[PDB]
Amino acid sequence: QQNFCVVELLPSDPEYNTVASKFNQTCSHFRIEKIERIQNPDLWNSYQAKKKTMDAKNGQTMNEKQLFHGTDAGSVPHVNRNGFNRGTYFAVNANYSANDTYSRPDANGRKHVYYVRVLTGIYTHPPSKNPQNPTDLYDTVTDNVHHPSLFVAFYDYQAYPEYLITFRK
Ligand SMILES: CN1CCC(CNc2nc3sc4c(c3c(=O)[nH]2)CCCC4)CC1
């Protein structure tokens, strides 16, 4: 259970182009080896379930964002099956996740950054909305509320690792 499939995208595919564009906004100086869509039905269903309840709760809020997460090659099979379970940091701009401390170059100089659907929801600088009602907390935290560059999720199934980007210098 929570099994997955890994589908490589053709650079001639609109879906590859979409992911690449966003990546190249801050990382056009890197070369992309490949992009793969991670298909994990049970992780996706858990994520959508949490999104349904979140959309019913946060009103006019656009709860979802697409953010980056750099990681070592060793971590790929874990993320693919488990998502980002047991907080976890995500970047607005790809170049931040492209730092060698997050996405280490493997033996061949290859670097790995996920492009993640994250349920950011309502967020602040896992704290509570009202200290009088400490059961209803904030969805994520960020570094800056008006000009965010990073978000941190805590609860499971709050982030779906849709695409994997393999690239090099
Ligand atoms: C063995 N480990 C290798 C490292 C990996 C860390 N993953 C990761 N951490 C961070 S902290 C941070 C960002 C970020 C990220 O993208 N990935 C981006 C925005 C700025 C702040 C965990 C497993």
UniProtKB/Swiss-Prot annotation:
Post-translational modification: Auto-ADP-ribosylated.
PARP catalytic domain mapped to chain residues: 1-169
Cysteine disulfide partners in this protein: none
Domain of life: Eukaryota
Tissue expr: Expressed in macrophages.
Subcellular location(s) of the protein: Nucleus; Cytoplasm
Induction of its expression: Up-regulated by IFNG in macrophages. Down-regulated by IL4 in macrophages.
Subunit structure as annotated in this protein's UniProt entry: Interacts with STAT6. Interacts with PARP10. Interacts with PARP9 in IFNG-stimulated macrophages; the interaction prevents PARP14-mediated STAT1 and STAT6 ADP-riboslylation.
Functional note: ADP-ribosyltransferase that mediates mono-ADP-ribosylation of glutamate residues on target proteins. In contrast to PARP1 and PARP2, it is not able to mediate poly-ADP-ribosylation. Has been shown to catalyze the mono-ADP-ribosylation of STAT1 at 'Glu-657' and 'Glu-705', thus decreasing STAT1 phosphorylation which negatively regulates pro-inflammatory cytokine production in macrophages in response to IFNG stimulation.
Family according to the record: Belongs to the ARTD/PARP family.
Name of the protein in question: Protein mono-ADP-ribosyltransferase PARP14
Gene source species: Homo sapiens
Gene label: PARP14
Full-sequence portion shown in this chain: 1614 to 1801 of 1801
